[PDB]
């Protein structure tokens, strides 16, 4: 009935987990388009190092191409292939 401590710890340590990134954060330059879907699921660094001095930073990355719908106001609509960064491996490092 109660979740075990070993599972809670390992599932919460610094590791690449699926995070829902808003596209506008990744591309703040294209302000004339309405993206659908406005968010994309990407494998990014999530979790906690259980130490206020350390931070969960990536050590190995890669990009993945997805098909995002671009809706220009009253001026046509088309489908475009856009790139999105992903994190393959994360690790705890000092911030300063």
């Amino acid at each position: 009935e109660v979740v075990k401590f070993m599972d809670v710890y390992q599932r919460s340590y610094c590791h690449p987990i699926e995070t829902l990134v808003d596209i506008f954060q990744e591309y703040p330059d294209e302000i004339e388009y309405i993206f659908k879907p406005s968010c994309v699921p990407l494998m990014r660094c999530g979790g906690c190092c259980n130490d206020e001095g350390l931070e969960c930073v990536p050590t190995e990355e890669s990009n993945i191409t997805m098909q995002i719908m671009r809706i220009k106001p009253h001026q046509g609509q088309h489908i475009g292939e856009m790139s999105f960064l992903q994190h393959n491996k994360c690790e705890c490092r000092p911030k300063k």
Binding site: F24, E32, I71, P73, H74, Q75
Partner: protein, 597 residues
């Protein structure tokens, strides 16, 4: 009016077949088609009744829809229509969106029509809303129509997403997807920050803001219109207040600024129908600008006693200077406590003659070591003031002995150097100047001369009017007046014919049984109600007597006289006699005399 071949509103047709439609009328007929292919099908048209026909080669499911023969091809001018259902064992949707769904611009609260129409009217189509939801048509809010699709009255928020129409034919499941997308396009307002004519240095960096305001579900396209060619970069970004509002930012940046870059810059926010354009100007070329002029420097000539006097001077400078004001040099800065600043102005509250001086001002633009001073001279006018008026001369209602040289002085000072002048006025029972021969005659005028004496720290100027022979009673008025004010003082110049105005002519008596002749001489108009008193007292009882039973009173200008004569003076008719003379200027003046025979 338009007669059609296939009578009715419904029709059944299979794939690979052909269409054969007629439309007989009088004038030409316009054929309304749901989808005109191209050079695929054919058409022709030929008492004599005009007949119009329409053919078709092969049969494709894409051509399901409204087939109408419009008889409106006449400017003076009914319409017939019928649905052609072209079916196929896969796929039975007219417009099939398997991979990419079709976008449907909609609006909350209005009507929404999903264009998933099928071929057979007996096809059962299920409508699903992602993720897991199904809309059941009821005939009122959700209506099903195998000719158009799904009709939704009052579209709420639950209809914004990915809709899918599904149908099952021959044990196989097909589905088409539609993506409702609410969107407006209302460019509310734009603003460049700041709208001021920006100034910069030849070599500085220009950074311009442009803010755009739109509601939710809408974008903009911002651009900058500069006169030169491709200079440097220009970033953009978007920010949301979450209420409901969108804000778009446009940051133009030119790292290398030159003289050619000077011109007009217009931020042009476009979004299709709605458009706005906010513009602003930019000046440059300047390097270290400090240029200060004034208005009438430096002949500033205010007058003392002025309340709230205000100097100023125009300052053309870039950038913002640090301004400090000075007076007679020197630091100054606000040494006199008063005199406020601000506004590149020099405001004196209450002006005094100690405020004169060449007011200097130091304008300091740091970060480049560029200063500029400027001198402006202030002169304060003082207005004249006679000092003889300040002194309270007790003696007197001034009278003078007859035939006497008298000297009268008036001392005054002011800026500019005032001017003095004397006049005249008798009394008897509109003025003229007086000099060294004037003015037949008032009094025998001798010398009127002024001199420059330095007394009390100021270089004052005093005039002296010297009468050589006072004969007639007058009033010599001295007046001092420069160009900013006037002040005069009238000097009362009476004249007495008798010692010090009051006199008692004493003609005594040899012995008992003789006579007494007393005479009281009173001046013109300074003692009135003249009388005679006698005293004599035994211990603490005293008091006065009389008078006034004649003989009259002879008024002789100048100075009246009172003659009293007593006949046969005995031992009791002689004591202490006095002349009592009342007055209105200041009360009482009595002159006594005691003699007994």
């Amino acid at each position: 009016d338009p007669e059609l071949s296939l009578k009715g509103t419904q029709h059944i047709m299979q794939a690979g077949q052909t269409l054969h439609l007629q439309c007989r009328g009088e004038a030409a007929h316009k054929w309304s088609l749901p989808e005109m292919v191209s050079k695929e099908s054919e058409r022709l048209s030929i008492g004599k009744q005009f007949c119009s026909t329409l053919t078709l080669n092969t049969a494709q499911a894409n051509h399901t829809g409204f087939y109408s023969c419009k008889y409106l091809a006449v400017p003076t001018s009914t319409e017939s229509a019928i649905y052609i259902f072209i079916s196929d064992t896969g796929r039975p949707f007219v417009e099939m969106y398997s991979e990419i769904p079709e976008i449907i611009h909609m609006t909350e609260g209005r009507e929404l029509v999903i264009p998933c129409r099928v071929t057979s009217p007996n096809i059962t189509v299920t409508l699903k809303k992602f993720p897991l939801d199904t809309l059941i048509p009821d005939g009122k809010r959700i209506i099903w129509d195998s000719r158009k699709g799904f009709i939704i009255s009052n579209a709420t928020y639950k209809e914004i997403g990915l809709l899918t129409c599904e149908a099952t034919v021959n044990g196989h499941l097909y589905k088409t997807n539609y993506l409702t997308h609410r969107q407006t396009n209302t460019i509310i307002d734009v603003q460049i920050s700041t709208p001021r004519p920006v100034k910069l240095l030849r070599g500085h960096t220009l950074v311009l803001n442009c803010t755009a305001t739109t509601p939710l579900n809408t974008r903009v396209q911002m651009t900058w219109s500069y006169p030169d060619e491709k200079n440097k970069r220009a970033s953009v970004r978007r920010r949301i207040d979450q209420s409901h509002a969108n804000i778009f930012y446009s940051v133009l940046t030119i790292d290398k600024m030159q003289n050619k870059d000077k011109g007009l810059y217009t931020c042009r926010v476009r979004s299709g129908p709605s458009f706005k354009s906010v513009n602003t100007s930019v000046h440059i070329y300047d390097k270290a600008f400090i240029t200060v002029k004034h208005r009438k420097q430096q002949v500033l000539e205010t007058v003392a006693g002025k309340r709230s006097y205000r100097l100023s001077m125009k300052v053309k400078a870039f950038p913002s200077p640090e301004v400090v004001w000075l007076k007679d040099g020197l630091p100054a800065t606000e040494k006199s406590a008063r005199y406020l600043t601000r506004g590149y102005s020099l405001i004196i509250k209450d002006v005094t003659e100690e405020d004169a001086g060449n007011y200097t001002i130091l304008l300091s633009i740091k970060q480049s070591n560029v200063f500029k001073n400027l001198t402006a001279t202030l002169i304060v006018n003082v207005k004249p003031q006679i000092y003889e008026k300040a002194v309270s001369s007790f003696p007197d209602p001034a009278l003078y002995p007859l035939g006497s040289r008298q000297i009268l002085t008036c001392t005054a000072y002011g800026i500019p150097q005032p001017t003095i002048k004397w006049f005249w006025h008798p009394c008897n029972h509109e003025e003229s100047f007086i000099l060294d021969a004037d003015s037949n005659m008032g009094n025998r005028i001798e010398s009127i001369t002024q001199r420059m004496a330095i007394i009390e720290g100021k270089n004052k100027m005093a005039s002296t009017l010297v009468v050589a022979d006072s004969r007639i009673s007058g009033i010599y008025i001295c007046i001092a007046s420069n160009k900013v004010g006037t002040v005069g003082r009238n000097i009362s110049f009476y004249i007495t014919d008798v010692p010090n105005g009051f006199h008692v002519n004493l003609e005594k008596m040899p012995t008992e049984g003789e006579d007494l002749k007393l005479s009281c001489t009173v001046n013109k108009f300074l003692y009135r109600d003249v009388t005679w008193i006698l005293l004599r007292t035994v211990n603490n009882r005293t008091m006065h007597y009389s008078i006034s039973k004649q003989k009259m009173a002879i008024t002789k200008e100048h100075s009246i006289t009172l003659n009293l004569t007593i006949m046969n003076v005995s031992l009791q008719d002689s004591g202490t006699y006095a002349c009592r003379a009342r007055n209105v200027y200041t009360g009482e003046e009595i002159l006594q005399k005691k003699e007994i025979t």
